[PDB]
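tool=predict chain=A
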Amino acid sequence: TEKRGRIYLKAEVTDEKLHVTVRDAKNLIPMDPNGLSDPYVKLKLIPDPKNESKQKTKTIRSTLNPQWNESFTFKLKPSDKDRRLSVEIWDWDRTTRNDFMGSLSFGVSELMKMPASGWYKLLNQEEGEYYNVPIPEG
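tool=predict ok
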């Protein structure tokens, strides 16, 4: 429930391809000494034991309201029926390990049946691997 902010994204599956658009995020949590963060988004299909599926947006420095406007494509295989699209926002740090900011996920089979679109509530790191929470209300 902790206020980690929100992210706007689209995710849909067409002809065995998963297309994801990471638009923007709002009200992220300060994670740097200067009171801001340097956010980027990591996308993966999990589980990913070999660590082969990772894609990420650019890092946007010094903001809590990043606008990435980036799109990504994943080629799907039959085994992806048991997988989830994981979306994690991280804070890039120059002098320390990067900080986790917030996350969420979508089942691949669930996206096939209905694309994701709109604002989603950011969850904690464990939480985010399991579900998502749309915020259609505002």
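The chain has two helices and eight strands. The domain at 1-138 is CATH 2.60.40.150 (Immunoglobulin-like).
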